[PDB]
Enzyme design. Structure first.
Site, mmCIF file in Angstrom:
data_model
loop_
_atom_site.group_PDB
_atom_site.id
_atom_site.type_symbol
_atom_site.label_atom_id
_atom_site.label_comp_id
_atom_site.label_asym_id
_atom_site.label_seq_id
_atom_site.Cartn_x
_atom_site.Cartn_y
_atom_site.Cartn_z
ATOM 1 N N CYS A 86 31.150 -10.924 -10.876
ATOM 2 C CA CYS A 86 30.971 -9.485 -10.991
ATOM 3 C C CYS A 86 32.059 -8.719 -10.247
ATOM 4 O O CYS A 86 32.662 -9.230 -9.300
ATOM 5 C CB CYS A 86 29.594 -9.074 -10.453
ATOM 6 S SG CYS A 86 28.240 -9.947 -11.240
ATOM 7 N N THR A 87 32.298 -7.490 -10.685
ATOM 8 C CA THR A 87 33.168 -6.578 -9.966
ATOM 9 C C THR A 87 32.436 -5.241 -9.883
ATOM 10 O O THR A 87 31.891 -4.789 -10.880
ATOM 11 C CB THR A 87 34.519 -6.384 -10.670
ATOM 12 O OG1 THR A 87 35.075 -7.662 -11.013
ATOM 13 C CG2 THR A 87 35.482 -5.633 -9.767
#
Ligand code: MET
Ligand code: MET
Ligand code: MET
Ligand code: MET
Lengths: 461, 461, 461, 461
Positions: free
Chosen positions: A1-2
């Site tokens: 994830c970012t």
């Protein structure tokens, strides 16, 4: 994830923004856009993965969510906005280390990303309340994962990180600041005396009494509780770097592997939703680390990109301040690898969601936006430079259309006697146009791409 | 397209210059050089593409123009000079963004590049009047394109950019300045109350009331209304960069991808017509980005060049000040990819135009300068380094001949009892010489090139 | 061509030097070394190329010259020294531009390089007189070429450049300065009122009245009348750069393409004939631009070298000051590509020339120094690194032998009753040794080279 | 050849050192270590090459020497130490130029490297006397070569360079200085009146009266009499550079081609025999110019190395100050390419030399150290990285053993009643150990190398 967080003085429109790419292990895993009305919310919650049992309050608020279509491993709601216009996104998997794990190990029957939005978001009326409730649940039930969680309301943005089985810390992002956060513990310098921080009451003693602090002075939480590994230099730090290079070019050096990039940053300009989606869709464009670019095979594959095949959903949760509260909450949403989609600004103040975004199942269905978007991104990946101009045109055309609908809908909000019905109509218009434009893009790609197939032989006359 | 503007104190001869490469989608599309006399000008105009219907004044001025031979998509006059010695070139396609498009969308039945010179140039007597008339027409009829338009007279040079369906802004280029403009919105720092600017009466309110401004301080119009995209870094900015490196080498850094290159520039010397044509014919010579150069395949094809296969016409509109008004207006013109042509200084004060430049049709005809020039540039493209020396000799030889004819014609202007007939004769001489030299060049290329064909086998004795 | 000029305080021996490589279009074109005695000089001169007819004075001085053996295109005398010890070399082809050519076109039946030494050198008794006579002839007859011409006597060195059909400018090189000049107009900053300059009486008016000056301040003649083209960056500027890097390393930057290298330079040491010959024989040694070096194919062939296959003759004209006037004039001479020859210091004060240097015809004859020198350089070109050590040995051995003969001849000049016969004998000794050493070099190359032929198969025992 | 000189305050032990690699044309040419006793020294000397005849004094001193085994071209003694503890090495071939050769040509029946030690060393009692005697002989007999010659005693180190057929100059190396000298004239800045210089009585007049000086100020002898050629940049200067980078890293830049590296240098530390042998054995280690390294084929072969296949002998002549005079003179010696040998510290105060070093003939004999060392170095060359660890171990082990023998021999010197017999025994022990260790090294190389032959096929079990 970012994840990308933006304070209310840092945005172009005075809104707060919290966002995340919900990246999974497998490339594809169908997502749904679902409003959970209070009557459908559990009071007796049990998780699938950990079998944790949590009794929940009997007064849940309505909230948007992005549950998995396939419920084999639980709901996995990811993120949403409740009827108090509080936003939450959970989680950003972060890192830990053996020294703290040796003192406060993961709890096998604790809470996880499967659970967090469901057991926190419906029961809080501010971002700070969200932080505090999540902190209480971690202390009581424990967790089996290292996680980062964002909260926002119309005033404040917070980032909470979990530490071992039961501990946690959280920071209020300054109004004029932004954060880019990868899968690595992020919180750095931490002031135990600040009004803008919260943590386990025993956190400082945990550090002091067990010789956990590697620094000669002060407290840096990721130095103490996180990682600065070789894997961080390729999997995590370059994502932070690219985002900071985009927003703070004159304050950011040229080493993507840097282990001590700041957590809290200040951009050289105000940040738009378009800006956030660009970074969340990026693949180190205009560097040798771009897998679609001109670098060597080793350079092109060295770093984990932000836009990626296993983007299951991307959400940008916006709490606006330039509007009445009944239209302040916007749940921006897209599906599939972010290179060939666009986020759609859905009004969160609704009782139900559009069919093209709600109805994905495990069966492949190109009438659904999850499957259609994934299909588009895969085709695009096979020859990016060939399809990117169509992609760029589509992005401008679609985003312009969404904003027109939003502007028209906002303008006529006064006097509406059934707000949810009015906004459900707006969301239907948005989803209809999003599908039509996604479909036209894929059609254009298929038509032009078919002319360029390997299996061809043309007479040039 | 690429545009270059030069103020009257910035030119070597005290003239104003506005110029543009008229680049289309297909490589070839035949162009004509045509004077539209008042009796030939419509009073009730309807476009082909959009079906916009514009009632025009009954007193149009005579003007030069460069209409398409094939009228399938309308006239596409591109550029010209009227009998008041006002010059206009329309258009440079620029960029926009979704935030402004969401507020003021394109107008499907509005004006476009198909139309602008036709509906503006015949009815104005100064550059500033041109700006104001175009602005009024955008407000009245709307537009379906993002465009940049240049105007000039013997005093002033203006650049207008269209913004959404109805808005616009314009800047007067300082007398001592120049501009290089690619296909990207260009106007930067903007003072609404300046004598050097004009714009929509509501432009500042539009920005302020809708949170369009991304900057903490002041107003930069392309920051607000334009783009700074990844595609800009390869399609647009390097062209601006190469031009500024040529004219302002000590004020320009070495990053072709730079997003904030200045709009208004000041060269280290006065600028000639030859200078402008060089930049308008360029392909990043002496850099790795030159497609005819020594760079890698990826570097050689990374940037869009300025000289290009789809240069349909190039025009440099010059309003001179060292001469009587009856010879002040010069419509410099060439056809086809700019690598193998020369601009010819046609006097604009004429009622008709030379046959080799006027009479192109859709039928291939090497007696016509459009087809002859395209043919030359294509052959030249097949082995640039082999043909470039002949190309260079031809350029000097041809330009020298044009200037001799211009100097002789200028010198004998006094006392001429039929000016238009005198200047038509001068233009005939110019076109005859231009054709003879273009033809001789192609002949020399064919003769020498034939010796170097792949299909050869010589005894070396 | 490439020219090098050295003022009398800049040389190692207090002499003046003017020099040039006489480069033609074809690789080989046989040259002769010829003294033109007054009785053999035309009084009624007609050129072959332009058919210009020039009546010449009836009192010409004797002069050395280097006429073509084959007279199809006229004499092409190139350079020489007259009996007043005035030196002249004509010409260095330079550049021009369309703005000046449009005002003062080439004159088709004017003077050219074919003619200049013949119509100027016999009739002047100083370098300055040479400048003025040539200036007058350009005004009277015109020219069809852009040319640079050097003049020298024991006091002064002058450089004249022709400008259009009739105009010209000239600069006296400072005593302590040198110049390296390629095929590009050279004169830069220019003071019309200096005793060190001469020009067309109307030159400043031509510039001022016709807007020829591109600069905001002052007059730079090559900015005004010359070129700064892309071709200049590869064909001309690197030759200037390499020469200036050799003589003025601490005042010269690292960009061979630089368009504004100074005309007048000051070396970090005094300059020898050996130095001048080195630069005139060079091919960018110890850079990637050396065709015989280690660079890429494109880098190795990017720049025009100074030593080159079409060096037809090289001459260094020296007017010495350390000796009686009867031996002051030295016409240093060699033939063929400068990589494998040596200049021989022939006394100019003679009535005839050595047979091996005088007798080339169109028939290949290796007993003649033109054909022998060309043959040596071609063989050397086939494997430069293999032959270069023999080359280097030969250069030292031959130059040492010439200087011994010169020193001995100079030492015994007093009391000689027939100076011309004495010096003719010395020149014969010089030419004989030059031939013997050139022949021995070729023999050594053939003997060693034959061992390294592709067509070989040796038993290694 | 490459020479290294070290003053008595620059060495680690307060000795003087002069050294040279005696490099020939052919790779192999057997060398002998020979003491010439007075009764065997010619009084009527005639050379083989030039047939020069020199009458010599009747009181020659005993001296060590390194004559060729094969006397076809004369003795070629190279270097030695006489019974006055004066050392001499002749010669280092240097460079010259045509301007001085034109004034003072080589003398065909003069002295050469064949002759110099034989006719100078036996007859002088100081380094300064050596300089003066050689200078006198050059004036009396002339020379046919350009040479550098080193002299030393326990106080002083001198470097003499020959100039033309009869001239010369010499510099006393400062006590705290060192010199690295390749095959290029070396002496730079020169003070004719220093007690630290000696030269031809007419040297300054030769320079001044014939305009030989290229510099505006002062006298730099190699500027005046030597070379700064392109060949120097690859054959000579990089060797000087590598040595100076090793001894004076912070005073030496990074251009190996530099033409004006200092002659006299000052190291950042005191210099050992081991240091000198390292530089004399080097091949640009840890640069791209190392033929055994990682560079491109062109970079690896661009520069002439110091250690080289045609090292016939290497000698380091040491006059010690930390011991009684009867053991002060050490003639360090090795044979063959310096990459796989070690210098052995032979006492010079002996009447005869060890058999393994004295008795080489033209017949290949691996019991002899010349042939054994050459064989080792050739094998090592076939796979340097494979053999280098054995080489390095052997160097430490052998040098340690020599030093132990030297230390023991030095410690027991007092009261030895037959000094020559005592030191001949020490030299026998040294040679015996040197042979055993050289042989063991080759054996280890052959044993391990045989395992890695191409002609192999092993079962891996
Ligand atoms: C898994 C998690 N949502 C990321 O990071
Ligand atoms: C198309 C338009 N003339 C620009 O670009
Ligand atoms: C041709 C001319 N002499 C050069 O330059
Ligand atoms: C040869 C000489 N001994 C060196 O140089």
């Amino acid at each position: 994830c970012t994840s990308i967080l933006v304070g209310k003085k840092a945005s172009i429109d005075g809104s707060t923004l919290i966002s995340r790419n919900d990246d999974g292990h497998e490339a594809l895993d169908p997502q749904r856009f679902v409003v959970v009305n209070p009557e459908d919310q559990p009071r007796d919650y049990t998780s699938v993965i950990s079998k944790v049992n949590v009794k929940l309050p009997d007064d849940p608020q309505r909230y948007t969510s992005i549950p998995n279509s396939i419920l084999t491993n639980g709901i996995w709601p990811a993120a949403g906005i409740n009827s108090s216009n509080v936003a939450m996104s959970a989680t950003e998997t972060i890192t830990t280390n053996s020294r703290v794990q040796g003192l406060d190990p993961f709890v096998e029957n604790g809470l996880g990303e499967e659970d967090l939005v469901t057991v926190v978001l419906p029961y809080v009326k501010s971002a700070r309340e969200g932080v505090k409730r999540l902190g209480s649940l971690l202390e009581e039930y424990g967790t089996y994962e290292p996680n980062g969680i964002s909260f926002a309301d119309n005033e404040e943005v917070w980032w909470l990180e979990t530490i071992g089985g039961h501990h946690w810390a959280a920071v209020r992002i300054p109004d004029d600041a932004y954060v880019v956060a990868p899968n690595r513990m992020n919180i750095d310098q931490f002031d135990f005396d600040s009004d803008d921080t919260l943590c386990s009451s025993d956190l400082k003693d945990l550090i002091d009494n067990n010789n956990l602090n590697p620094d000669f002075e002060n407290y840096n939480l990721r130095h103490i509780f996180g990682s600065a590994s070789i894997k961080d230099t390729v999997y995590n730090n370059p994502r932070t770097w690219y985002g900071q290079k985009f927003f703070s070019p004159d304050d950011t050096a040229d080493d993507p592997m840097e282990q001590d990039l700041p957590f809290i940053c200040h951009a050289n300009r105000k940040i738009s939703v378009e800006d956030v989606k660009f970074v969340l869709s990026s693949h180190f464009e205009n560097t040798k680390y771009d897998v679609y670019g001109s670098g060597s095979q080793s350079d092109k594959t060295l770093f984990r990109p932000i836009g990626i095949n296993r983007n299951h959903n991307v959400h940008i949760l916006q709490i606006r301040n330039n509007v009445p509260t009944e239209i302040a909450g916007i749940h921006w949403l897209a599906y599939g690898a972010n290179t060939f989609n666009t986020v759609v600004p859905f009004y969160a103040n609704v009782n139900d969601t559009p069919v093209q975004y709600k109805n994905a199942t495990g069966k492949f269905d190109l009438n659904n936006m999850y499957w259609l978007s994934c299909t588009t991104a895969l085709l695009g990946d096979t020859d990016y430079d060939f399809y990117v101009d169509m992609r760029n045109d589509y992005e401008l055309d679609a985003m312009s259309a969404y904003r027109k609908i939003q502007n028209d809908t906002d303008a006529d909000i006064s006097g509406q006697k059934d707000i949810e019905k009015y906004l459900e109509n707006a969301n239907k218009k948005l989803a209809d146009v999003a599908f039509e434009k996604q479909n036209k893009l894929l059609g254009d790609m298929v038509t032009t791409g078919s002319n360029n197939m390997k299996l061809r032989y043309n007479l040039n006359d």
